[PDB]
Amino acid sequence: SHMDALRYHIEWNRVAEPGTARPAGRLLAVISPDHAGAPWVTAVLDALGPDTVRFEAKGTDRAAWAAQLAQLREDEGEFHAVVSLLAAAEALHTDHGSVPLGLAQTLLLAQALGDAGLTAPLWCLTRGGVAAGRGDVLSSPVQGALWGLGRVIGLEHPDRWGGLIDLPETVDTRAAARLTGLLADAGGEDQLAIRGSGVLARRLAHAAPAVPGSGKRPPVHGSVLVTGGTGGIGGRVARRLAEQGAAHLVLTSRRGADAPGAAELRAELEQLGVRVTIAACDAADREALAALLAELPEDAPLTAVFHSAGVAHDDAPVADLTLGQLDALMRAKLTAARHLHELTADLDLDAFVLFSSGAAVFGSGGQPGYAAANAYLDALAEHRRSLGLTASSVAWGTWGEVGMATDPEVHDRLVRQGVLAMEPEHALGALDQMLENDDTAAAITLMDWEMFAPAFTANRPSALLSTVPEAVSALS
Numbered sequence: 001s002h003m004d005a006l007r008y009h010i011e012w013n014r015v016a017e018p019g020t021a022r023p024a025g026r027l028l029a030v031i032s033p034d035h036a037g038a039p040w041v042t043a044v045l046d047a048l049g050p051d052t053v054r055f056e057a058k059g060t061d062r063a064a065w066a067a068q069l070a071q072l073r074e075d076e077g078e079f080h081a082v083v084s085l086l087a088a089a090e091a092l093h094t095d096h097g098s099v100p101l102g103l104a105q106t107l108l109l110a111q112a113l114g115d116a117g118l119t120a121p122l123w124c125l126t127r128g129g130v131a132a133g134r135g136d137v138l139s140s141p142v143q144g145a146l147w148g149l150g151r152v153i154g155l156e157h158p159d160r161w162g163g164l165i166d167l168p169e170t171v172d173t174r175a176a177a178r179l180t181g182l183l184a185d186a187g188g189e190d191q192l193a194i195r196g197s198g199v200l201a202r203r204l205a206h207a208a209p210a211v212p213g214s215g216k217r218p219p220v221h222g223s224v225l226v227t228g229g230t231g232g233i234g235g236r237v238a239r240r241l242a243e244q245g246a247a248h249l250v251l252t253s254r255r256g257a258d259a260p261g262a263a264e265l266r267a268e269l270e271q272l273g274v275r276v277t278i279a280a281c282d283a284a285d286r287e288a289l290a291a292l293l294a295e296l297p298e299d300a301p302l303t304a305v306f307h308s309a310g311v312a313h314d315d316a317p318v319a320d321l322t323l324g325q326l327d328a329l330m331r332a333k334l335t336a337a338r339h340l341h342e343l344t345a346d347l348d349l350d351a352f353v354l355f356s357s358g359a360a361v362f363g364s365g366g367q368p369g370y371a372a373a374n375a376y377l378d379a380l381a382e383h384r385r386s387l388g389l390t391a392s393s394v395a396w397g398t399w400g401e402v403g404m405a406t407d408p409e410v411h412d413r414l415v416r417q418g419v420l421a422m423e424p425e426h427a428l429g430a431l432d433q434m435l436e437n438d439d440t441a442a443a444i445t446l447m448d449w450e451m452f453a454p455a456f457t458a459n460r461p462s463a464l465l466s467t468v469p470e471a472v473s474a475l476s
């Protein structure tokens, strides 16, 4: 099927045991000084050895760090690699309430390295930011956001990007040796998870063909909340839910009833017999969300959430992105989804569906803020499954007809790259296959691999795509 052919999923496959020698040259370790106490942080610093130079990245000051780094690189000469432990800073930034401090500090470290002329490859370490291997628990969705930023750094600064490595809970000596071995030579891999049974790396595969009933999807009923539900994709999802018999759709956006197209949307939905509530309110306002949930009918309790609230604009290259831009991109994604998760965790929902993007799953040049925000969604869905709660993340490709991609501009960058506009009916039917399977994560995208693979790999290989045969064929 055509709908099957839009669905892909991320897998983690075993790779080679690394060598036994640590890096010959000197490592530079970067530490968040208020967040240096986690066990894995001390285990990593121990594994890097006492000869490793240590840089405490204090606060968020690009210019100060550029100066400090330039001084270090003057004194030492070229480093073998930069190893960042900034991801351990999960606390929100004091001035940007939707940006984890470690995310802010990572962006500014990537900036200041470039400013100071350090060219050693940057490796970003996380602990629990991916779900890798049968039974693996994604414990930190906040650290998971950093992977969407890293993948973009790999596309914008391939020559000075090492990669991302997720550590296990307990970094024992076998885990330490895998780490230091990868830092010496990672065999062309750059998205890695170190686990008790081996080193795994991240891979994209075609999803298994749809099996109706396998996931035991309950019938759509009760109240269903679609955030961004007046927006392009949210609207077409609400119309599908309505076709499928929802009792009550609750559609939100910051403009609510004043959003473009809302009256027409409400009328088309109501002709289907559905009760329609359209509310103005910001998905990152916890008190407004709570108030909205408090209003639901006894006869129509919340059964499902579809989180389509989002903006992509006002992003910038890694070298230029500000923290205020990053905060505005994170707000509807990390802040709003955290709220949705927390206020629905006891409700036994049938579906909790987060709309992510291919920018998070692949990386996309020019979109670091949006990739980090959407990668947090994907990680939160995995996290929620670990809690025994239902959750789905869908990393859409480009939609045709409706939504944020419908305009020649930076629709054309993507299209020239092989990421094609999907027909909405096909995208919706593929999402329906995913929910019928009860799959936790998918990318749903129409790709021309012959165009995409060579373009995406021109500066650097991508081990991610070696499990897509069309990409292997395009590179042959």
Ligand SMILES: NC(=O)C1=CN([C@@H]2O[C@H](COP(=O)(O)OP(=O)(O)OCC3O[C@@H](n4cnc5c(N)ncnc54)[C@H](OP(=O)(O)O)[C@@H]3O)[C@@H](O)[C@H]2O)C=CC1
Binding pocket: 227, 228, 229, 230, 231, 232, 233, 234, 252, 253, 254, 255, 256, 259, 281, 282, 283, 284, 307, 308, 309, 310, 311, 312, 331, 332, 336, 355, 356, 357, 358, 395, 396, 397, 398, 399, 400, 402, 403, 404, 405
């Ligand atoms: N269209 C596509 O090709 C792709 C879409 N996606 C994702 O799908 C989702 C929907 O995208 P699409 O329908 O195309 O985009 P739209 O711009 O058409 O809709 C997005 C919307 O979310 C609402 N929104 C934005 N910020 C907030 C907020 N803080 N609180 C509540 N609502 C908010 C907007 O209304 P308002 O401005 O009034 O708040 C609008 O309803 C987005 O999350 C997007 O990132 C991912 C990849 C591709």
